[PDB]
Amino acid sequence: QLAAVDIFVSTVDPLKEPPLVTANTVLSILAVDYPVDKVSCYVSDDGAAMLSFESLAETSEFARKWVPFCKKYSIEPRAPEWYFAAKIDYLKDKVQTSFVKDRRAMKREYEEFKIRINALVSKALKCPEEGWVMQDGTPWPGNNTRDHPGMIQVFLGQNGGLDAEGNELPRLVYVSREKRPGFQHHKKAGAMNALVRVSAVLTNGPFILNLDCDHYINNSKALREAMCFLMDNRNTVFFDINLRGLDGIQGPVYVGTGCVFNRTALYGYELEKRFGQSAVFVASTLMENGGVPPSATPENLLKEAIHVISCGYEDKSDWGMEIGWIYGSVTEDILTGFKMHARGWRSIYCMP
Ligand SMILES: O=c1ccn([C@@H]2O[C@H](COP(=O)(O)OP(=O)(O)O[C@H]3O[C@H](CO)[C@@H](O)[C@H](O)[C@H]3O)[C@@H](O)[C@H]2O)c(=O)[nH]1
Numbered sequence: 001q002l003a004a005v006d007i008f009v010s011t012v013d014p015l016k017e018p019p020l021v022t023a024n025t026v027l028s029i030l031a032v033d034y035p036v037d038k039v040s041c042y043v044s045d046d047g048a049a050m051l052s053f054e055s056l057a058e059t060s061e062f063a064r065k066w067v068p069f070c071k072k073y074s075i076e077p078r079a080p081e082w083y084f085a086a087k088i089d090y091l092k093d094k095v096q097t098s099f100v101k102d103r104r105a106m107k108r109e110y111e112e113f114k115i116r117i118n119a120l121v122s123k124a125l126k127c128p129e130e131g132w133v134m135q136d137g138t139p140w141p142g143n144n145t146r147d148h149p150g151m152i153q154v155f156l157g158q159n160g161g162l163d164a165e166g167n168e169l170p171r172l173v174y175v176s177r178e179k180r181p182g183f184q185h186h187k188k189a190g191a192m193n194a195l196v197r198v199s200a201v202l203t204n205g206p207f208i209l210n211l212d213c214d215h216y217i218n219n220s221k222a223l224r225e226a227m228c229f230l231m232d233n234r235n236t237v238f239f240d241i242n243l244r245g246l247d248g249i250q251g252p253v254y255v256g257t258g259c260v261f262n263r264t265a266l267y268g269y270e271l272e273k274r275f276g277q278s279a280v281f282v283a284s285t286l287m288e289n290g291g292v293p294p295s296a297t298p299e300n301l302l303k304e305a306i307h308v309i310s311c312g313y314e315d316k317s318d319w320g321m322e323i324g325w326i327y328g329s330v331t332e333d334i335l336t337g338f339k340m341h342a343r344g345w346r347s348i349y350c351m352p
């Protein structure tokens with residue numbers, strides 16, 4: 001069967017990470033061949049850049065058109081920039097097909113999307129003096145890049161509006177963890193640990209996958225292929241049920257980008273606020289088949305998700321020490337990946 005997957009993308013700087021490339025990665029995720037309620041996309045923005053927030057907003061709106069198109073016509077790859085680069089053979093058709101008509105309209109929609117993103121980048125090139133202001137009229141909470149509250153915004157999903165055929169889309173979650181002078185943030189490693197916790201509060205999928213912001217999914221069946229291995233030339237795979245044992249794999253395994261791996265392996269254990277002072281998160285670590293308690297409102301969940309990204313959350317905890325992505329510059333050569341402990345079940349499937 002098909003287990004839920006939480007997909008993590010970390011970004012920091014739209015000037016080094018062009019918004020359109022990130023958008024293409026996100027669109028290839030949102031259009032993946034998978035039940036929409038069982039794939040979720042979390043984008044961490046450590047730059048707290050309004051440009052990234054707004055380009056992700058525009059991206060979700062375009063996804064509402066792009067996703068049903070790809071699924072109707074079995075498009076590959078589902079990153080529009082790369083799909084539209086491939087040449088099509090119009091001469092083999094006597095008359096314009098429904099596919100060709102739909103594709104010509106989709107391509108101009110994509111060109112228009114691109115122009116809007118270019119406009120966002122241009123406007124970002126030069127500050128106004130009072131900092132940025134949002135749709136509302138209210139100021140952008142991340143104007144001070146090193147001194148700003150935690151921000152979470154859920155797009156699409158169950159309550160985020162339908163695609164062009166009237167169907168729900170996967171959740172897309174913007175996350176910018178809190179930053180305050182006097183608190184270390186540990187860069188990507190700290191972002192990934194924050195995303196482990198945010199995802200656990202909001203979806204808590206048994207499997208996690210971390211993609212670079214330019215690593216678009218090339219084959220929409222990638223998650224199904226992974227599940228063919230994870231549930232009872234070639235790519236990297238690992239399976240282990242560890243007990244006791246001078247036998248078998250000894251010690252932890254570390255996993256980086258592009259691999260689906262099982263979440264509970266992160267929680268590998270030696271109280272329980274080695275995990276930090278979140279009742280909701282600690283409870284989530286105890287559900288062996290994932291999910292969230294049915295009686296939590298998106299509103300209370302958004303509480304809890306904000307709490308788990310506060311800048312002091314990891315103080316007095318094992319995060320970055322023995323749990324999650326591990327902090328370094330001492331002995332441990334990680335923060336090249338998540339630490340999967342021996343204790344129980346471990347499984348990894350990496351994409352080609
Ligand atoms: O605060 C941050 C910084 C980076 N990243 C992510 O981590 C990855 C690394 O990108 P990079 O531009 O290399 O970030 P750096 O913090 O600068 O990490 C580098 O810092 C040195 C100087 O840039 C480099 O020589 C090293 O390759 C590397 O450790 C990207 O996916 C980034 O989105 C975050 O999530 N949060």
Ligand SMILES: [Mn+2]
Binds near residue numbers: 184185186
């Ligand atoms: Mn810390």
Ligand SMILES: [Mn+2]
Binds near residue numbers: 213257
């Ligand atoms: Mn990355």
